[PDB]
């Protein structure tokens, strides 16, 4: 069924072994992790909690990666089956064979974590819904070029070549467009107006948690 | 050569001006600085009390001659341009032009065309500024909400930037989706680009960098 | 400044002439007209109000058309200047010359209407913001084709060729895509789910007036 | 000819079957109805208690032969196909194949290929169903809110329909914006298209219209 | 409703026909087989010696009603269509229509529209045949020579196939380069496609497969 | 400088070793090979020449592959440098070290072949110039579909969906277009007319060798 | 059948009236006009022939315009039918009615000209076949821009933005591409090499008349 | 940070250089003028008889550091870059690095990075020269013949210009058809563009305009 990215096998090894106290603090902190939090500030929360070890800290990527799976889980998919399917996949890529005690404790630890992966599921939902668009912005760059006006017996233009890099059809693409100084000003004003509108939409609808991924 | 019927009244008017008024029009067109629009040329005539309302009404037609001066064949005298324009007006006059008016028109267009040097530079700049694969026209941002539905409230604010541009002489739309951080980073790049323009102006201080108006 | 579509000159003629009572009822009804109402149900509201005549009814297109202008009107554009600029444009396309009394009454009547064009301005804003997208849907059609599977010594496919007609870059365009029976079912389910989500978004946010243009 | 290393175990297994098991595999593959997926072929072997787990493990490899049967040169005997496959397996066996196994493999593939007639029809249908300029894969709708900001609350609900399709062997996205009425009218057309399919099935009742699985 | 000024003479003419002529027009339009063009409808009127030249001159206008019958709202009587057309003609008559002619036109259009059933099917086929992403219009092949220049005579013959098509209601060109073998293989596929059409006609023998004309 | 496709190292091994008689027959046959001949009919010519062995036959791909290099060779690129650059590259991918006698004989044999690779260079030139187009045809397929005309109380269309597969921008692409029966006939006539024009262009210009690659 | 561009009705008026001597010289000169000659050098040939009048000179556009029709004329289309169909169309756009004598003389004069329109038919064939391409060049322009390299405590690039204007799908389009100085040099060399190849193709195949339209 | 296995030998080599050799490498890299390619850097090391073959073998790896210097976070010391590179090498050393070599590598990379200022400018120019919507790579012209077939010899010579370019990080082809006059006019514009470049160099004489190599 599942196949585990080879670099996460280290984190499942750790996860089969976390102490029943430590796994509960680690799952507790995961549930406390607010929606939109990236893995590095989940790591930072682990690294500072004096109840969580360096081993828990090293498991953060594996735990956080389950959010990509959690979006598939139906209303009647049981988390026990998920914890076992991940446990059987983990064992199948050993050259050792995983002892039954380690197997049981891993199923339990993953299940305990999956029970608390609620805001993590919302974080992967937010991340995919943010990029469900025809053209998702990634970066911009502006070249500020000079175009000299040649004469028939000292005059010139400055052209702002805006590059937008975007994803469309899962493909990295670039759009170039030519702006004068006044175009750059009026586009800056529309961008400012859209930020002003974002702050208005947050003060209204103040009962919605609006999410930033970065 | 043909004259658009939009401007026939202006060649008529311009054929009717005094040597004093037309000499003042040409000198004023010569002082008009490169990058000046027709509104500033009209404004400058209006404030000169030795140019009439007929001179002011000619100003839009005169400013159009900046374009033709880009198209002329390089061996042509401006006198052949003035004659060709005058016949192209007379051809549109179903009432036949007076011989006095034909002389005055060739004279008046040619005296103007002699000072059209900055008008030519102004139209070169207009051409060269839009000699680009995609030319910006307008921008608009739709600040949309996308709610995150749980299976059993949380949401995204998505900035849908619309860029309107000309390409292949065609008017087109580019939509792209930005979050708050993307909007700041795009704004930060635009500022940095405006700073770069001011640097290229502070260096290269002997080049006049012109803004279209 | 302005130029008036030749067929609306009839409606300005009527509008210069509505009775001070009738113009106030007509502007009152305009302000009562809810956002998203099209001109034909503004006409229908006029046609039924026993205080508004057949002449008011014939003016409805001209009044309703001002909403396209009202989106340009700045915070310090005065409605008097709008009413006069429309009045000077109206007179300039007469072959008669408009008498001063008719001019004054038209400025007043248009201004009285423009003061009540609030939900009409929102209706034109809604209409433009609804079509501010890369591809605005206009129509769909499905061809239900048969593709026979030929054999080497009675079997076939049914292919649902969905056509979407859309506007992009102000251009009328068509997109064809090929669906099997199961694709048509799963797309129908996503469309149903999106309608369910629209009804949820209306019950939440029940303090927002959500607008349909048709 | 080459065998993908994904299926080498299946030719090995299939070379190891009894004449009884392989005769039952071929007959069962012959009864498998057109449009059956490999899951149904596997399921049908599993429930036949005279086919082994080795037979069940061969089923994915056998079902792949439906594709090759579309590519074969029309004068070829299925016996030349079986030999070419057997050499293409032996070429991948760095441990050299037994002569008994070479006979059994050519025999076992050929007995199967003799009954692959509905498997060929099933793969024709798969090809012909995706022989289209744009083939549907998935749909998703984002129900977004677009607030109408007054200069001094009102909003639009916009259904952003995403269609995912294959074109030019490439995976692509088409986004289109719908209002509530557009979504109903599109749904109404889909229903009408499903009704048309049932009519084409009720008429033309002697054609088997197959669904891919 | 509006009438194009191209056809006003035809509604005029058609308003002027006898109950005998108009009954013969409708019956003849009813016998006209699906897929018949206006040339065949004109030809069939011409050879019927009880239809006049005025009937023949009406034929192009009548054939245009096949299109409108695709656009009508399904609850409408054909009598409301005939009235709406008659007012749309009277609206274009700056000389006002006689009341007798208004009755005769509603009568004459409605008697025709009653037999337009195969004309409707003919226009459905026209629509459905061009309800495609790219519709063929024309082909042309340029047989070009490309010489192989040695550094110190040999050449390629390249068949530049041009396909002209409609897409997005726009007229477009597709050029593709073929060698001699590609041209034969493309020709071989077209023949095989024509054979497949004749098979689908020999089977399904109770379906009328219509050609546009 | 060069790097040798690992499967051609076998053919260079053979080529370092062909007998001075056999290499001259093999190069002689290569020069006799007419422009447009593919490797399999070069192989077939080797396989039948009673002076060329099975070893020569196994070298045909390596010899024929030099035509892709021969298009780069300038007016003052010496074939000795080519034969050595290929010989030094061959040795560099051994785990053995190639003996000097084998090195000298390979340089000589390759040089003798390269001196006779004239029509082979024209064959690679022909092959590249044939595909120097915006859209190079690879294959066509026609689906012969039925489109039924539904009615409001037994009529249908047959639509020939022609697929052309082509290369553009080094990318495999497909173009679908819809034809009726008469379109298929008129396109067939234009294709026939273009074949007739090819035969005319060959009878005129009968002093040009016109090349087919397949 | 035909409809005549309103400005060519003047030339048919002249053509109905040319003298039997003059029409034969005018058709004789047309047959002498070499393939690729434009109308202005047909006019120039008329203007200098002392047997052709100013009236013949004014007819040159109408005569030359028949080449666009002549490409449609089949192997069994008779020129008499063409001359009459053009004559009946000419008369139908008079407000006068054309006298029978004028009608007969026009049919004869056009037919006499059409009999000599051979190189004119080749000139319209050449003109259409020259533009039977995916992208027909119309104009180029290069902007020579400066791109300054900014620094972190006097260096720059010159970028040659080549614009090609072309027709594709009957649409006026532009392609911009960015070149450095060396790209401009190497493209110039390929263009020179293609001109050298054109001169070679003319010296070989010296029995073909190679045509330039401009 | 990761090192590509293509360059691991170069960090190894570079970790093994003397303070004398590495000081000469850095100074020489500092004198290398902006726009110099790695071939000229290699050539300049080779001719300096106080740099070894190991120094010459390091040159390709050093020249690659111009790229990383565009990506560094602006607050970073070059010392943190050198450490990060050294750990990224040690991470790829399955045989563990000596502590002496770790010091020498951080030292040797940092002494080089101190003089990489013109290497940074050289890589900026490379980036900025290809920061364009379509970047030229190659051109080719096919001089084709198109014979004019009479119904009962004459021909066109058509110059098929192919431009190869990068767009969207993708390699693409633009074909356009030119006649002899179009080819001359395009050549005339290119010359005029080269003249304009020399003018922009003769004016603006205090700017170094660099050519990529």
Numbering used by the authors:
A (entry chain A), C (entry chain A), F (entry chain A), G (entry chain A): 22 to 174, 180 to 240
B (entry chain B), D (entry chain B), E (entry chain B), H (entry chain B): 23 to 174, 180 to 240
Please quote the authors directly.
The ten eukaryotic COMMD proteins are core components of the Commander complex, with central roles in endosomal membrane trafficking and signalling. We find that while CCDC22, CCDC93, DENND10, VPS26C and VPS35L are restricted to the eukaryotic lineage, ancestral COMMD proteins are present in both Bacteria and Archaea. These prokaryotic COMMD-like proteins have very low sequence identity (<20%) to any eukaryotic COMMD family members but share a conserved and highly similar fold including both HN and COMM domains. Our biophysical studies, crystal and cryo-EM structures confirm COMMD-like proteins readily form homooligomeric rings composed of eight or ten subunits assembled from core dimeric building blocks and inter-dimer interactions that are analogous to the heterodecameric core structure of the eukaryotic Commander complex.
